[PDB]
Every structure is written in structure tokens, then in C-alpha cells.
């Protein structure tokens, strides 16, 4: 229906995002690990930062399955649709930004061991959008399916 498109939107956009993010960050880490094999552990927190975003998004998608029927009212659909969008594209956008910063920051790490935590700060801000979108989306979806009175 429209709720099935909701499910689609959520599981596609947040993976597509997270995937870029992890990729980007990853490549930067691959450079850093051969230069000093000690910054390995510090490197692990940027790459995986985009990794916790994903696991959130996936949870909303699962939700939506349970909320799914075979054919349902238009009103139940369109809210279901718009919710799934939300966590999906905020997931998408957060996942992207964090990877770009992240990659460049791992080189920063390489020259400045001390400042691993500072690269991290930048990343954490871009996460508010993703985390806030998960929240909102989860609550919407659950409330949405009640078959009218969404």
C-alpha cells in the first residue's frame, strides 16, 4: 500500500547512508593503521559512529512490518509513508556527513593522537538529526496504525 512504501523508504535510505558513511571513514582508517598501529582503537570510534545510526533505522523498518496488513485505509498509509521517510532521509543525511568529516579526521588523528576526541565532537553533532528522526518516526509509525485515527 502506502505503508509498504514506508517500510521500503526506511530500510533503503538509512542503509544507503550508513554504507557511504562507513565506507568513507573506513578508507581513511586504512591509511592511518599502517603509519602507527596504535591509533587503531581511536580510529574505530569514527567509522562505527555511522554504524549505530543504521541499527536504529533497521528497528523502525521492523516496526512497520508488524504495523502492516494486506490492504489498509488511505489515512493509515500516508502517515506510515511520511514517518518511514523521516528516519530514512535523516539517517541518510547524517550517515553521509559523518563519513566525509570522519575520513579527513583520521589523518588528523595520525599527526595528532591527542585530539582523537575532537574529531569525534564534530561527528556527534550531525547525529542529533538522525537520533531525533528515529524517535519521531518510531512514535508516528506505532500510533499511525490503528486503522483511522492516526
Amino acid at each position: 500500500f502506502f505503508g509498504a512504501i514506508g517500510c521500503a523508504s526506511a530500510i533503503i535510505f538509512t542503509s544507503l547512508g550508513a554504507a557511504y558513511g562507513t565506507a568513507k571513514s573506513g578508507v581513511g582508517i586504512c591509511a592511518t593503521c599502517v603509519l602507527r598501529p596504535d591509533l587503531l582503537f581511536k580510529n574505530i570510534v569514527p567509522v562505527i559512529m555511522a554504524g549505530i545510526i543504521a541499527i536504529y533505522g533497521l528497528v523502525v523498518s521492523v516496526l512497520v512490518c508488524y504495523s502492516l496488513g494486506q490492504k489498509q485505509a488511505l489515512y493509515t498509509g500516508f502517515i506510515q509513508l511520511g514517518a518511514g521517510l523521516s528516519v530514512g532521509l535523516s539517517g541518510l543525511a547524517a550517515g553521509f556527513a559523518i563519513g566525509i568529516v570522519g575520513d579527513a579526521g583520521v589523518r588528523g588523528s595520525s599527526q595528532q593522537p591527542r585530539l582523537f576526541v575532537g574529531m569525534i565532537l564534530i561527528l556527534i553533532f550531525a547525529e542529533v538529526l538522525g537520533l531525533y528522526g528515529l524517535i519521531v518516526a518510531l512514535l508516528l509509525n506505532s500510533r499511525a496504525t490503528q486503522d483511522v485515527v492516526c
Binding site: 565506507a23 568513507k24 578508507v27 581513511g28 586504512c30 591509511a31 599502517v34 579527513a104
Partner: protein
């Protein structure tokens, strides 16, 4: 924004370059190497790097002239010649063009050299796409412009030389070493600009953009300084006038290039540039190096970018030269003139 594209081809060129940069001489090493005067110590620092392979082969505590040239030649084959061949797409092309642009100065000098009559065989190192065993001699024997055009068409991909030859027909390049080289450089820098412009939307140029302009400004002031008090023909582009975003102006470069003394320009230009205008030829030379040395390292902060690999190649030429300069002094137990005096890499 960079890394907002998925590339099969960019992934290969970027990793292979990073793989070399690991063993590569750091800023701290060069700082340590000037301090040295001990024959053994120079060996040790170097043994450990990409250049160290060649050093191990024949073990020499005092490094002569020949040894240094042989090591650098060996090192450009693994790093530049090879890489292109296992690279594909737009990324291999960008590497071919940078290598061929360096080749156009070398090959140009060989051709010009035939006119003067000169001895050839092995020619001194530069980054060239294919050795002196392939391309450079085939180009060299044609001194006739007509045959030059035909010989470039055989090379697949094409060299810049095809355009350069069109130009020398209409005599916009004149004769004599100094004027030709100034025009060859003007084209060289022009080709850099066209590439960035096409290339920019998926890998952005930030670090690369600042470095490409600062490089351009330096190259042009240097050409001008050279033709200050040595004679300068005013209607020729021996002032190296080329487009800019306004960091260096055609007017201010022209003033320096002619024989009228225009040292002032350099000082007004600088506000964060190393070269600030001096009366010492030697002190100017030192500064030029350090400026062009900076911002390549900054470019490495970016990754998955056309920006990264370009800045790395141009740093490599400046490192091969630093190795030569330092190594020779320490060998016969002297300290460096230019390298000991510079302290920012």
C-alpha cells in the same frame, strides 16, 4: 565534498599512492637529516624508506653523485610508470596528463638539443609516462614539425605535444631556450586549470585549489625574476601571463619580468607567502621551496580525491631534489647551504 562517489578506478589509484606515502620521508626526517654530518646516520634514516631499497643494494657510507641519481631513477619507475598501467578510467588519464606535461619540457629540450647538437643516451630523471626507451627518442629524431604531428598520433593516449607543434608552425613560440620554456610552462599550468574545472563536481578541490594557485603565482614570479637583469623582450610572454582569480595580476608580473627592477611587487603580494622580497638571490630561492612544499601535506588530510594524488606527485619531485642536496654535503663532510637554512617542509 569528496567520497560522495563510488569509483572502481579512483579506489585503485588512491590506495597505491597511500601505500607509497607510508614509508615515505616525513618532515621530521628531513629536519633530522640536515642536522647530520655523520656518514652512517644518513644511511640509516634512508634505509627504511621507499628510497632505502636502492641504498641497501650497494652499501656506501659516503654517497657519490652517481649513486643518488641511480636510486631516484629506480624509484620513479616503481612509483609513476607502473601505476598508470594498473589504473583505469578518468583517474589513469589524469596521471597520464601530469606525467606527459613534465615530459613536454624534457622532450622539448632533447629536440632543441638536436638543433644545437648534443649527446644523448640516458637523460636525467623526471616523471615521464614511459621511459627514455619508448617515447622520448622516437619524438627526438623528428625535428621537422610536420613529422612531429604524425608521431604524436601514433601515441594512444595523445600527448600535449600535438598542440605544442601546431603552435610552433605559426611561430608563436619563436626560437631560443628561455622563451620556449616560458611558453611550454604557460601551457603546462593552462592544462592544470582545464582539468580542475571539469573534474571538480564529485571530488571537490579545496586544498588542491589553494595549492594550484599558489604554485602558479610562484612559477610566474620566478620566471620573471630570472629574466630581470638578463634582457627581456617586452611583447613576448616571457612574463608568463596566464589566467588567475586575482592572487597574482598580469600587470604586477610584467613589471618584474622586464629589466627595470621591480622587487617591490613581491613584498606587496606577500601577506602570508614565504617570499617577501629580498636583495639576496639565494634567500629568495630558499623561500620558494618552502612555500611550494607547504600545502601538499595539507592535501593529504583529504582522501578519495583527485586533489590528493596531484599534490603528492608535485611533493615527490621536491623530495627527490632534497635527498640529493642534503646527501651530497654530508658525504664530504660539509653542511647544506639551502637545506640547512630551510626548516619548514
Amino acid at each position: 565534498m569528496e567520497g560522495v562517489y563510488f569509483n572502481i578506478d579512483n579506489g585503485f589509484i588512491e590506495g597505491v599512492v597511500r601505500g607509497y606515502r607510508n614509508g615515505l620521508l616525513s618532515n621530521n626526517q628531513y629536519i633530522n637529516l640536515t642536522q647530520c654530518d655523520t656518514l652512517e646516520d644518513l644511511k640509516l634514516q634512508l634505509s627504511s624508506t621507499d628510497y632505502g631499497n636502492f641504498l641497501s643494494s650497494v652499501s656506501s657510507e659516503s654517497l657519490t653523485t652517481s649513486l643518488i641519481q641511480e636510486y631516484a631513477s629506480s624509484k620513479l619507475y616503481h612509483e609513476f610508470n607502473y601505476i598508470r598501467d594498473q589504473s583505469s578510467g578518468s583517474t589513469r588519464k589524469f596521471m597520464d596528463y601530469i606525467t606527459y606535461g613534465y615530459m613536454i619540457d624534457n622532450v622539448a629540450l632533447m629536440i632543441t638539443g638536436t638543433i644545437h647538437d648534443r649527446d644523448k643516451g640516458e637523460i636525467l630523471q623526471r616523471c615521464h609516462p614511459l621511459g627514455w626507451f619508448d617515447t622520448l627518442p622516437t619524438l627526438s629524431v623528428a625535428t621537422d614539425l610536420e613529422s612531429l604531428y604524425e608521431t604524436v598520433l601514433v601515441d594512444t593516449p595523445l600527448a600535449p605535444y600535438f598542440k605544442n607543434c601546431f603552435d610552433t608552425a605559426e611561430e608563436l613560440d619563436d626560437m631560443n631556450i628561455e622563451i620556449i620554456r616560458n611558453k611550454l610552462y604557460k601551457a603546462y599550468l593552462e592544462d592544470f586549470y582545464n582539468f580542475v574545472t571539469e573534474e571538480i563536481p564529485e571530488p571537490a578541490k579545496e586544498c588542491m585549489q589553494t595549492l594550484l594557485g599558489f604554485e602558479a603565482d610562484r612559477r610566474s614570479i620566478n620566471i620573471a625574476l630570472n629574466s630581470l637583469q638578463s634582457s627581456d623582450i617586452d611583447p613576448d610572454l616571457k612574463s608568463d601571463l596566464l589566467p588567475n582569480i586575482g592572487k597574482l595580476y598580469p600587470l604586477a608580473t610584467f613589471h618584474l619580468a622586464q629589466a627595470q627592477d621591480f622587487e617591490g611587487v613581491r613584498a606587496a603580494l606577500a601577506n602570508v607567502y614565504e617570499y617577501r622580497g629580498f636583495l639576496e638571490t639565494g634567500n629568495l630561492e630558499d623561500h620558494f621551496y618552502q612555500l611550494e612544499m607547504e600545502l601538499c601535506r595539507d592535501a593529504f588530510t583529504q582522501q578519495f580525491a583527485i586533489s590528493t594524488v596531484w599534490a603528492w606527485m608535485k611533493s615527490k619531485e621536491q623530495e627527490v631534489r632534497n635527498i640529493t642536496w642534503i646527501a651530497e654535503c654530508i658525504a664530504q663532510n660539509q653542511r647544506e647551504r639551502i637545506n640547512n637554512y630551510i626548516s619548514v617542509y
